[PDB]
């Protein structure tokens, strides 16, 4: 009866539970906020490039993470763990989003073939340029300046989104925004802007890690205060009229 009811109890499989451990990843962005409020719009077209060095599993699993396609923060937030879509606390997690990682867009674990010849991952020394499209969303990117067609419509841009980049461990990459720090191998195409116009004063722009709650503290557990963003009021700069 034990072996009979063992082999009777196993093949049900609605009883059989599932678990899947996942790597801990981290999103990042530059200090630039979008803040593109219609009425006094500064720019609607930006451009930046992401140069890379290494994306291999050095002592790790090959299931890495490195994405740039902008996600809906009206649906996503920067937390280090959560979500029924197999986690992956980075870019392109929410269903109302996409994410470009060389060959495809994964809108909430729904594979969407992005149209480009020589589809290959974000491998060593492969730039990833960014481009903005809002009014009719066809958000261009390019990998080494080749036509990444089939861009994403109905990404919820009701208002705005945020600039993003995701990366797992075992990663070594560089922004390309402007000045010395953006050595634009593929320049902004016609109707775009090397994304350093908003190098606002009082500070040199830099990364932010997507408003982290607590870095690897060492002195004592710093209860870093609640900050929503640059402004507790809203997400907008001030054109005075």
């Amino acid at each position: 009866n034990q072996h009979l009811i063992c082999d009777n109890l196993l093949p049900g499989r609605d009883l059989l539970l599932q678990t899947r451990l996942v790597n801990h990843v981290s999103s990042m962005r530059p200090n630039i906020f979008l803040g593109v409020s219609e009425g006094s719009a500064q720019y609607k077209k930006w451009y930046y490039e992401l140069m890379v060095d290494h994306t291999e599993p050095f002592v790790t699993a090959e299931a890495t993470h490195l994405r740039v396609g902008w996600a809906s923060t009206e649906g996503y937030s920067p937390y280090p763990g959560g979500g029924e879509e197999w986690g992956g606390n980075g870019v392109g997690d929410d269903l109302f989003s996409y994410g470009f990682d060389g060959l495809h867009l994964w809108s909430g674990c729904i594979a969407r073939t992005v149209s480009s010849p020589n589809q290959h991952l974000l491998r060593t020394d492969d730039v990833i340029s960014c481009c903005l499209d809002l009014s009719a969303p066809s958000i261009s990117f390019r990998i080494n300046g080749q036509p990444v067609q089939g861009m994403f419509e109905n990404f919820n841009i009701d208002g705005l989104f945020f600039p993003v980049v995701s990366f797992s461990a075992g990663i070594k990459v560089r922004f390309l925004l402007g000045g010395r720090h953006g050595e634009f191998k593929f320049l902004p195409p016609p109707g775009y802007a090397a994304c350093y116009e908003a190098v606002l004063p009082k500070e040199k722009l830099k990364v932010e890690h997507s408003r982290e709650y607590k870095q690897e503290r060492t002195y004592t557990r710093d209860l870093l205060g609640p900050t929503v963003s640059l402004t507790q009021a809203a997400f907008t700069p001030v054109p005075v009229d």
Partner: protein, 107 residues
């Protein structure tokens, strides 16, 4: 059939012959992104010669449709996979399979 798709192909022409251990280091997958198998977590590259009918012929046909050092996204089907029977306890009936196949060597 095995609608092979390349990821990072190498030489592109070192196809496998008969009696050649495809040293495959795959990561088996299902639809929805639900994992069912993996060789990377094991650190045990899968090995199989051609024609002897160890694995489902998805692996055999895809390997035959594959070169050395070729990372590829294989796509098997229920006819070649376990099908309406299903490997019990893991696989349900009528399943389409995915494999992050990466052939390394042939001995």
């Amino acid at each position: 059939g095995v609608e092979i798709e390349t990821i990072s192909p190498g030489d592109g022409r070192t196809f496998p012959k008969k009696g050649q251990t495809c040293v495959v280091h795959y990561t088996g997958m299902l639809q929805n992104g639900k994992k069912f198998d993996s060789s990377r977590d094991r650190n045990k590259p899968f090995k199989f010669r051609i024609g002897k009918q160890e694995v489902i012929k998805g692996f055999e046909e895809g390997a035959a449709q594959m070169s050395l050092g070729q990372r590829a996204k294989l796509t098997c089907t229920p006819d070649v996979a376990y099908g309406a029977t299903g490997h019990p306890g893991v696989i349900p009936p009528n399943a389409t399979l995915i494999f992050d196949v990466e052939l390394l060597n042939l001995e």
